[PDB]
Symmetry: C3
Subunit: 114 residues, 3 copies
């Protein structure tokens, strides 16, 4: 999996270790070794949620398979919890777009995963 | 809907009430309460359109349903309009990727909209 | 084609002419008129790949058709080579998401491409 967070929360409010924690928690959650996992956090965004400039986050999680009803509910609990715990972002001000990618549509190391 | 703008237009060139106007114009456009509308503007971007570095925008609109031929035509007229007027980007230098998301693939509030 | 690269490489390490080279090279590789090609580079990102903060990149390539098995392998080799040459990013620290967009779902010039 690769996971991207865009948030209006200031860089300084992103606690040390947060990328490793994302990397670790997603490894566990998806069942994939941590060497495959990309994580990307973008603070200080100019964004709004429901007209409010209170803290929020717009996210995406890409995965080849392992995408579905129950699984995505389980990810959302997990990631929202992390965003609430570490960045003080309320889960009802979080969106996470989930993408089930086909292996041939994901590039890596001069090729694709197909 | 959620709507993201990425652009090479300077930050000080984005009007103060732009997020709200995006929020409000989209809520009217899509019939969705504003409370659900997320907006996101990313200025000062290193980007080029047609080999050119004059102002441009790369955008996306994610929505659960409410995506398709006429609606997307209408959204583009609406959104290009706003980018034309407020950010003074020409419409033939704007891309807008539309995404019809399944409710099960959008995380919010420790679950999904499924 | 529109191509976006996010990377933890510092802005000063992005060489002069890189966007033009990407436009040019994407134009060559897709045969598509360069006037419609969009490129977008985002340096200094806070990101990790395999748990590591060594140079990496997360990218996307949107296109209306001309997305497929061999083509994507060809794009990956082209694009990873550029990122290796120009930004000194190892190709095994690069993800590229490929998207075959429907024309009805791509907004441009107050309309869509349908
Ligand atoms: C986890 S192993 N992610 C690999 C991946 C999947 C989909 C898109 C990009 C990267
Ligand atoms: C408008 S009600 N957008 C809600 C939404 C749709 C798709 C993805 C994130 C959020
Ligand atoms: C290359 S000609 N890209 C045009 C395009 C396709 C899909 C989405 C945005 C732009």
């Amino acid at each position: 999996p690769m996971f991207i967070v865009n948030t209006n929360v200031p860089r300084a409010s992103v606690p040390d270790g947060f990328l490793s924690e994302l990397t670790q928690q997603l490894a566990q959650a998806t069942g994939k070794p941590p060497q495959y996992i990309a994580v990307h956090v973008v603070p200080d965004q100019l964004m709004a949620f429901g007209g409010s400039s209170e803290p929020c986050a717009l996210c995406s999680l890409h995965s080849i398979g392992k995408i579905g009803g129950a699984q995505n509910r389980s990810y959302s609990k997990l990631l929202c919890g992390l965003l609430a715990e570490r960045l003080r972002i309320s889960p009802d001000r979080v969106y996470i777009n989930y993408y089930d990618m086909n292996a041939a549509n994901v590039g890596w190391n001069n090729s694709t995963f197909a």
